Write an enzyme that holds these catalytic residues in place. Structure first.
Site, PDB file in Angstrom:
ATOM      1  N   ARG A  56      -4.823 -19.453  11.860  1.00 15.54           N
ATOM      2  CA  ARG A  56      -3.459 -18.995  11.959  1.00 15.54           C
ATOM      3  C   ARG A  56      -3.121 -18.926  13.444  1.00 15.54           C
ATOM      4  O   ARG A  56      -3.882 -18.358  14.241  1.00 15.54           O
ATOM      5  CB  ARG A  56      -3.298 -17.633  11.300  1.00 15.54           C
ATOM      6  CG  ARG A  56      -1.852 -17.090  11.476  1.00 15.54           C
ATOM      7  CD  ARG A  56      -1.630 -15.714  10.875  1.00 15.54           C
ATOM      8  NE  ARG A  56      -2.440 -14.727  11.575  1.00 15.54           N
ATOM      9  CZ  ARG A  56      -2.735 -13.519  11.093  1.00 15.54           C
ATOM     10  NH1 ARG A  56      -2.247 -13.117   9.903  1.00 15.54           N
ATOM     11  NH2 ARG A  56      -3.461 -12.688  11.835  1.00 15.54           N
ATOM     12  N   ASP A  90      -0.999  -6.794   3.502  1.00 14.25           N
ATOM     13  CA  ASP A  90      -0.986  -5.805   4.561  1.00 14.25           C
ATOM     14  C   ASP A  90      -1.813  -4.584   4.185  1.00 14.25           C
ATOM     15  O   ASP A  90      -1.786  -4.138   3.018  1.00 14.25           O
ATOM     16  CB  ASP A  90       0.471  -5.397   4.790  1.00 14.25           C
ATOM     17  CG  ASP A  90       0.622  -4.241   5.747  1.00 14.25           C
ATOM     18  OD1 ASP A  90       0.387  -4.413   6.981  1.00 14.25           O
ATOM     19  OD2 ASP A  90       0.996  -3.125   5.342  1.00 14.25           O
ATOM     20  N   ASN A 139       0.818  -1.226   0.000  1.00 13.67           N
ATOM     21  CA  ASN A 139       0.000   0.000   0.000  1.00 13.67           C
ATOM     22  C   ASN A 139       0.840   1.259   0.000  1.00 13.67           C
ATOM     23  O   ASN A 139       0.417   2.317  -0.499  1.00 13.67           O
ATOM     24  CB  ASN A 139      -0.886   0.077   1.251  1.00 13.67           C
ATOM     25  CG  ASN A 139      -1.651   1.437   1.374  1.00 13.67           C
ATOM     26  OD1 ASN A 139      -2.523   1.739   0.555  1.00 13.67           O
ATOM     27  ND2 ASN A 139      -1.345   2.226   2.419  1.00 13.67           N
ATOM     28  N   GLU A 197      -5.555  -8.217   4.981  1.00 14.10           N
ATOM     29  CA  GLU A 197      -5.694  -7.644   6.312  1.00 14.10           C
ATOM     30  C   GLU A 197      -6.683  -6.501   6.226  1.00 14.10           C
ATOM     31  O   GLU A 197      -6.365  -5.430   5.702  1.00 14.10           O
ATOM     32  CB  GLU A 197      -4.382  -7.084   6.869  1.00 14.10           C
ATOM     33  CG  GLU A 197      -4.575  -6.533   8.283  1.00 14.10           C
ATOM     34  CD  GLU A 197      -3.652  -5.391   8.667  1.00 14.10           C
ATOM     35  OE1 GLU A 197      -3.001  -4.776   7.794  1.00 14.10           O
ATOM     36  OE2 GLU A 197      -3.588  -5.117   9.882  1.00 14.10           O
ATOM     37  N   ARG A 256      -8.566   5.280   1.153  1.00 14.90           N
ATOM     38  CA  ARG A 256      -7.791   4.625   0.104  1.00 14.90           C
ATOM     39  C   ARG A 256      -6.721   5.479  -0.540  1.00 14.90           C
ATOM     40  O   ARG A 256      -5.664   4.977  -0.963  1.00 14.90           O
ATOM     41  CB  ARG A 256      -8.708   4.152  -1.019  1.00 14.90           C
ATOM     42  CG  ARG A 256      -9.307   2.743  -0.785  1.00 14.90           C
ATOM     43  CD  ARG A 256     -10.109   2.576   0.514  1.00 14.90           C
ATOM     44  NE  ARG A 256     -10.699   1.236   0.512  1.00 14.90           N
ATOM     45  CZ  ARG A 256     -11.874   0.963  -0.068  1.00 14.90           C
ATOM     46  NH1 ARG A 256     -12.576   1.953  -0.625  1.00 14.90           N
ATOM     47  NH2 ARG A 256     -12.345  -0.271  -0.081  1.00 14.90           N
TER      48      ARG A 256
END
Ligand SMILES: [Ca+2]
Ligand SMILES: [Cl-]
Length: 496
Positions: free
Chosen positions: A337, A197, A100, A233, A158
């Protein structure tokens, strides 16, 4: 992107948080393979900022400098060596992909990076990629600060900088291409998939365009047509314009409601009780089971400031933690997990652990190796929850009961519950303040079963408690509320 690509009969991945590649390679061979672990989530393997104040925090790994595979975990050769050795024993590697953003916009220019690459945040220059000013969202973002200020506005979430993190212009093919280039390198080396991520901070569509450029998995280890397992995520407890479901088109999504609720229940907070878990899963408002990546805690929220706040259970709360992790691993909801952590000097000053930034055990910044004690726990302040018998045995429990239906649920209306997985496993929990002594229908074939919480089956006997299941599938359980591990679990492969 929905298939884990683990070896058949392996159902969990373990986060070896901040571990070095050489230590993970050995762990694959000496432990993860023989104990049935499906794979490992590794810390971001790409070059990041070396942050010197505070001293080498865990968070510096979430501030990329380039895509060179060169970090405190190791260099490219060590990365490749780890992926090869792990795949060769049937244990997968999943990479934490930080795509990102690059680093903090106020970080000083220079070569303070884990591979010595020069970068200049202020001028938006990362020549080791390379990226330049044209590759960031500075001109797209509409907030006065350039940072994310309001989570009610999905576009700024975003297009703006998360806490000042330089925000890559993922709408551009050149940027999509550099990230794909990095991800393909990882794929061809042998990686099975990715933890994406900060997915909330990217348009599901930009993620798609990036994933569209990816190779199929390495055809020496994975069947033809195999795609990288993708888990994104996204922290979504409700009430925001962005939803976990917005990302289903790309793969699985982390279900943060999972550990938040489970932690509340096991701690018996907010009026919650274990008997309420009988409709655990979609019944509690969670996302569909086939898209959820579940976990009791993760690297962020085990520090106490994630969405689950203080209710999140961790190794610090070992007794309740083992039970929560056990419930998770026994229950068919989601893909599981398991966390594996390091100790740090937790210090609270009114509400915050001021040491929640502390990186892994280290000698002047050099990450310490993982040492193994004679009793198979770890040294050098590595917790190794995944090696605790009570957790490791439940990892196998999940493998053993894979595909069996949730059944034979029991509860006492309070905090004494039990359930089975078809005819292959049964688990019993006592979280009330009195003993749980009761004969229960287990669904299992008659026999003597080793309790795999208390002990292990070895050479025709048990090192722990033995449970006797008679012809009608019924068995007597007795669990004192003062038991250090107040739960028992038995399965088809713990039968004598
Ligand atoms: Ca963004
Ligand atoms: Cl996560």
């Amino acid at each position: 992107q929905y298939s884990s690509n683990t070896q058949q009969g392996r159902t969990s991945i373990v986060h070896l948080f901040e571990w070095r590649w050489v230590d993970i390679a050995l762990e694959c061979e000496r432990y993860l393979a023989p104990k049935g672990f499906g794979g490992v989530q590794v810390s971001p393997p790409n070059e990041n900022v070396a942050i010197h104040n505070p001293f080498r925090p865990l968070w510096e790994r979430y501030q990329p400098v380039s895509y060179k595979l060169c970090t405190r975990s190791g260099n490219e050769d060590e990365f490749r060596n780890m992926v090869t050795r792990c795949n060769n024993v049937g244990v997968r590697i999943y990479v934490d992909a930080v795509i990102n953003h690059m680093c903090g916009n106020a970080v000083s220019a220079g070569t303070s990076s884990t591979c010595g690459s020069y970068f200049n945040p202020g001028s938006r220059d990362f020549p080791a990629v390379p990226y330049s000013g044209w590759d960031f969202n500075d001109g797209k973002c509409k907030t006065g600060s350039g940072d994310i200020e309001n989570y009610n506005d999905a576009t700024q979430v975003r297009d703006c900088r998360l806490s000042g993190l330089l925000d890559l212009a993922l709408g551009k093919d050149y940027v999509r291409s550099k990230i794909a280039e990095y991800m393909n390198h990882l794929i061809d080396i042998g990686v099975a998939g990715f933890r994406i991520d900060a997915s909330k901070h990217m348009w599901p569509g930009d993620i798609k365009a990036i994933l569209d450029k990816l190779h199929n998995l390495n055809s020496n280890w994975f069947p033809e047509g195999s795609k990288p397992f993708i888990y994104q995520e996204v922290i979504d407890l409700g009430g925001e314009p962005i939803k976990s479901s917005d990302y289903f088109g790309n793969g699985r999504v982390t279900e943060f409601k999972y550990g938040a609720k489970l932690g509340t229940v096991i701690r018996k907070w907010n009026g919650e009780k274990m008997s309420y878990l009988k409709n655990w899963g979609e019944g509690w408002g969670f996302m569909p089971s086939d898209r959820a990546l579940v976990f009791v805690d993760n690297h962020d929220n085990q520090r106490g400031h994630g969405a689950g706040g203080a209710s999140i259970l961790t190794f610090w709360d070992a007794r309740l933690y083992k039970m929560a992790v056990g419930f998770m691993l026994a229950h068919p909801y989601g893909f599981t997990r398991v966390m594996s952590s390091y100790r740090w000097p937790r210090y609270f000053e009114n509400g915050k652990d001021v040491n929640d930034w502390v990186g892994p055990p280290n000698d002047n910044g050099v990450t310490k190796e993982v040492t193994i004690n004679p009793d198979t726990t770890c040294g050098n302040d590595w917790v190794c929850e995944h090696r605790w018998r009570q957790i490791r045995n439940m990892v196998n429990f999940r493998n053993v009961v894979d595909g069996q239906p949730f059944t034979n649920w029991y509860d006492n209306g309070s905090n004494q519950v039990a359930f089975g997985r078809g005819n292959r496993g049964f688990i019993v929990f006592n979280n009330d303040d009195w003993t749980f002594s009761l004969t229960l229908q287990t669904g299992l074939p008659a026999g003597t079963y080793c309790d795999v919480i208390s002990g292990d089956k070895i050479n025709g006997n048990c090192t722990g408690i033995k449970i006797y299941v008679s012809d009608d599938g019924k068995a007597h359980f007795s669990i004192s509320n003062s038991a250090e591990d107040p739960f028992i679990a038995i399965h088809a492969e713990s039968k004598l």
